[model samples]
Target: GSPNYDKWEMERTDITMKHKLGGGQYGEVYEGVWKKYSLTVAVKTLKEDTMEVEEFLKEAAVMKEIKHPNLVQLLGVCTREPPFYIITEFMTYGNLLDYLRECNRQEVSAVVLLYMATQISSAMEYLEKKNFIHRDLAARNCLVGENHLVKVADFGLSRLMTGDTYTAHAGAKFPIKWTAPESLAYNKFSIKSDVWAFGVLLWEIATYGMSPYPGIDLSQVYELLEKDYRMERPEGCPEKVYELMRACWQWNPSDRPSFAEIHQAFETMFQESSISDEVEKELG
Candidate 1:
């Protein structure tokens, strides 16, 4: 009920594949063209044997059910054979994390962060409203299209909130750099945990893809949590924006802001144009 993708359905498959866009443990993306429609699209085919087919179906269902400007559109599903495929709109610009990294001569800008944060927050709000939580929300998850429009992708790890009933398996954990303190310990993911991840994501965006420690000998980021050292904003981070990231990354999830509040704060920051000129020129 968010964005209507009626015009862009993935049924008619005269798609002549031009090239491979990306690949992962679950699937591979191919650049293809729908000749009749003369439109470019990406066909993502999941390897059925890699994992259970039901997970793929669940991902498809999540995409189909939730339609947001910050989330990709589900064209259709084809489950006839070993190489089951899912097609959707192709983003020409790719994801935000790599986008920033590619721009070598840089500083983080307010507007760029605003644009990324707004799209991410909008998607998160929509998902939370639907009782779904994107357990993984990061810069890499944010796909950028022409003119910087964003569509969040990869719902394979998403989960539906069912009241107080939550579970975690042994030896499995979410990404440490983005994981909330309690989430890392309890092996549970909630909306608050997503916010915590977003905070790291925002810092990653602001720092132009720099990880927490520039150079250090540490087996895991887990040590930082025990030391009570959440990521520190590196030099050159905008004061207010850095503060916002800190607010979201609080060890106590109870201290984090709700998605609604985050959206409002972002809108205000966007209007003020808080970033310096150096950062604007460097945004790729």
Candidate 2:
């Protein structure tokens, strides 16, 4: 059955509404729970205007296919006639943006940044092994769970490319600071593009959630990033980690490390004796 028009209220006695999540272009999410599982979850109800019938089915298929511990779980989906809903694991700490914003004010200690980087890198490792491309990999798309575990979310732009060397999108666009040079120009994207996006995400985490550049509008950001321009990483960012970020955003995808390599790189960087005392504390 379609959503009830009379109420127009997503809140329902039948389904307990925990609270509102963030609002994206497509829809809004609410923290919710189901009696059967007695577990916390999130329900994303797409706006009727943007809820194309095919999109529901397509998104449901994508949700069903993806299963990774670092990635948010898709518990189930409800697709009646109109305004479909997707239920996924609810991250208690909320999106990465909010966490970083709070960190900016309170100051996220080096230990916290290390955990955040490792968790996100682990998630990206899983996605790369599966050969799926998360077209958008930003701080906003990451969700934090209990014990500071991080999970990547928002796969609406995700596309699977199992064997192809390169995946291209026609006129595909996203936030300028988050896109790789080639992607911004030729609409060509591959694993390296994700690396570039992750670099920007790294900046977000290291800078206490500061934007890539201060005072630059989206349009200028697009042009600057397209020309392979970037800013210095956060002051506290470890040299090896910072170097890896540069490697990730290299003009050529082949130059970037495989996801497996990325995971190992962090492992090496965080090794007890390899890093300086200050860096070791960050890893601690």
Candidate 3:
């Protein structure tokens, strides 16, 4: 438990649970208020088979060390008793997937999409530097804050790697469409594999959260990839954006760009896009 993770420990009585934000197979997330601090927070309650108090605290300490703007801030945690709580800043707009699906699209939306993806890349870049691989990088795993601010989250499967790659247990479950081929077949995960998932996430952004591979069934994705098949450029996706997506889908993991490199590309891409908007703004 890093010996002194007590600094981030919370009193279970201090929090007032509100409505449920969402639920997962292992636990539930709720909109809550920490009465001690008088702040609203998102409380993620960890349930059975996953909550050895010392185990949770060990990983919780790892989370405490991370402080990136585009990553959800782990405010504190409650491990005094069962139903352990992980408190984070409450994101008003909730998950990016549902938000993107509900939002009205426009030409300007592309620029915003680039902006969002760029922010995510920045976060992943930070995680990469820390040698922490986000095992699940998807639009569904992100959260939207006010005024289009997005943060990468849902660290249910995130792993801090000691070596170049982390191998999963043979029978582990993962989403086929968002997983890299090597990860799907070999259960090996690394930052490059995360980049592959980021590509699909970018596709989600470009298409406003549309599901990938329209007619292709889950079992067929690996076969298709082996045949050099990839998702087509979405209707509204910029050529440069699609190119980056394709780069992430490279058959060779070594060929994929680092998240640091990816962020730089998107930074420039967004800067150029916003320039077009700047001209229009000047006319007004």
Candidate 4:
């Protein structure tokens, strides 16, 4: 969908990768410096033999086409060599998975968590508006920028929807626990499926990075979901937040709320919670 893509191409010498941030779902992520601008950045390297060079660049294409403050932006790429790099603006705190876990340990305010949730929904709303479906939506796929800002990343499996849905062409692996019934039963993916994944993501935030379906194995997820088994309310999670999660995990994809609705609901909740927290701060 991008025209004149060369603008994103970086001279192999421009970026300098430093310490490892952490492992991304696909490859290693690193902290780096963009010497040309004296700026810090994050670089995700494409592992050798993972896929053809062309396939990796195509994934970068998805990142390049979209731009939002809450959505991770592609800054540049160095594809001239064997270890290809996809560069993006560096996130300060690191991935949301690590950040959420730390928040629980440090006992951060629920209002702050709600703020992160709204940011993710806003980004998803942007993607949905553009007809782009992020097949992978999870805590691990989102990065925490400075000031607890969350930006959705890992667009490796994202695609533009055709018609009402996009059927995956091959036997691509999907995260079963986060997938909607329609997507797991068939290869069909759409914004509705993204909603299902968002519910699972909410649970992740609610539990502060706890794994989904704790006792169940990956292979058992499909059958368990088919029987209407859903995750129980996370301890310490607000009742209304769990209700929203249930709405997203609807058996029928058509019943799930759109990202537009999700964003609006979360924004409303965030405003009220932020106000309540400020009142508490003033009291003591």
Q: Clashes per prediction?
A: 1, 0, 0, 0
Candidate 3: misplaced stretches above 4 Å?
Answer: 1-5, 23-26, 47-55, 106-108, 155-170
The sequence of per-residue lDDT tens digits that candidate 2 reaches over residues 1-284 is 55554222233333555767664432467888865658788887665745365776776777687787788888766665445677787888887877888754333566567667777888888888777788888887788877667788873432321222123335433566677778777777787789888887888887867767777765575567557776776687878778888888777778877778887777655554235646655986
lDDT of each: 0.69, 0.70, 0.83, 0.82
The top-ranked prediction according to lDDT is 3
Pull out the clashing pairs in model 3: none
Residue 238 shift from truth in candidate 4, angstroms: 1.8
Top-TM-score candidate index: 3
Full ranking by lDDT: 3, 4, 2, 1
Which 10-residue window of candidate 3 scores lowest in summed lDDT?
A: 158-167
Residue-level error in angstroms, candidate 4, position 55: 2.2
Question: Deviation in angstroms for 82 in model 4?
Answer: 5.1
- CA lDDT of 178 in candidate 1? 65
Candidates 1 and 3, the one with greater TM-score: 3
- In model 1, the runs with Cα more than 4 Å from the true position are 1-12, 23-26, 47-51, 80-82, 104-108, 155-170, 216-220, 274-284
| 1-284 per-residue lDDT for model 3 (tens digits) | 68666788888777899987654421467889989779999987766645366666666777898889999999889876677888999888888888999887763276789899989999999999999987889887899888899998864532321221223335654667888999888888999999999999999998888888887777678999999999999997899999999999999999999999999999999999889977877998
Which digits, one per residue and each the tens of the lDDT, describe model 4 over residues 80-136?
Answer: 676889898978877787788876444457998899999999999999999998888
